[PDB]
Amino acid sequence: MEKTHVQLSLPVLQVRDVLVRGFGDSVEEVLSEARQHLKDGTCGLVEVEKGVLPQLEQPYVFIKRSDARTAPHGHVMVELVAELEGIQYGRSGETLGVLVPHVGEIPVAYRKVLLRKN
Numbered sequence: 001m002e003k004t005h006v007q008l009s010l011p012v013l014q015v016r017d018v019l020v021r022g023f024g025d026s027v028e029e030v031l032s033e034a035r036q037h038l039k040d041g042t043c044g045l046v047e048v049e050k051g052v053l054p055q056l057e058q059p060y061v062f063i064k065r066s067d068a069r070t071a072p073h074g075h076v077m078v079e080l081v082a083e084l085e086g087i088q089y090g091r092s093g094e095t096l097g098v099l100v101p102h103v104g105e106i107p108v109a110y111r112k113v114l115l116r117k118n
C-alpha cells in the first residue's frame with residue numbers, strides 16, 4: 001500500500017514560468033490537490049526569494065523540513081504546510097519552497113525529498 005514516506009525528485013521552476021500559480025481556493029483543497037499532483041508526478045517547486053509569493057496565488061502550499069538530523073539516501077525529509085492570509089496550517093521546519101502544479105515548464109534543477117505523505 002502507501003508507505004508513510006516516498007522518495008521524489010521535484011522539478012524546480014522559475015516563478016515567471018509558472019502557468020498555474022496555485023492548487024485551489026481553500027487550505028484543505030490546496031493540500032489535497034498538492035498531494036494528488038505529487039502522486040501523479042505533476043508537481044513543481046519554486047524556491048522562495050523576495051518577490052515570489054506575491055507572484056503566486058493563495059492559499060500557498062509549502063514543503064518544510066520535518067527533521068534536521070538526517071537526510072536518508074540523499075533526500076531531505078519534508079512535510080506539507082499551507083498558508084492563507086498569514087496563518088499556517090501545520091508547524092514544521094525550514095521552507096524548501098512553494099509547491100505548484102507542473103504543466104510542462106522547463107525546470108532549472110531538481111530537489112530530492114523524502115515526503116511524508118500525510
Ligand SMILES: O=C(O)Cc1csc2ccccc12
Nearest residue numbers: 002003006035036038039117
Ligand atoms: O508512493 C506512492 O506511489 C504514492 C504517492 C507518491 S507522492 C504522494 C503524495 C500523497 C499521497 C501519495 C503519494
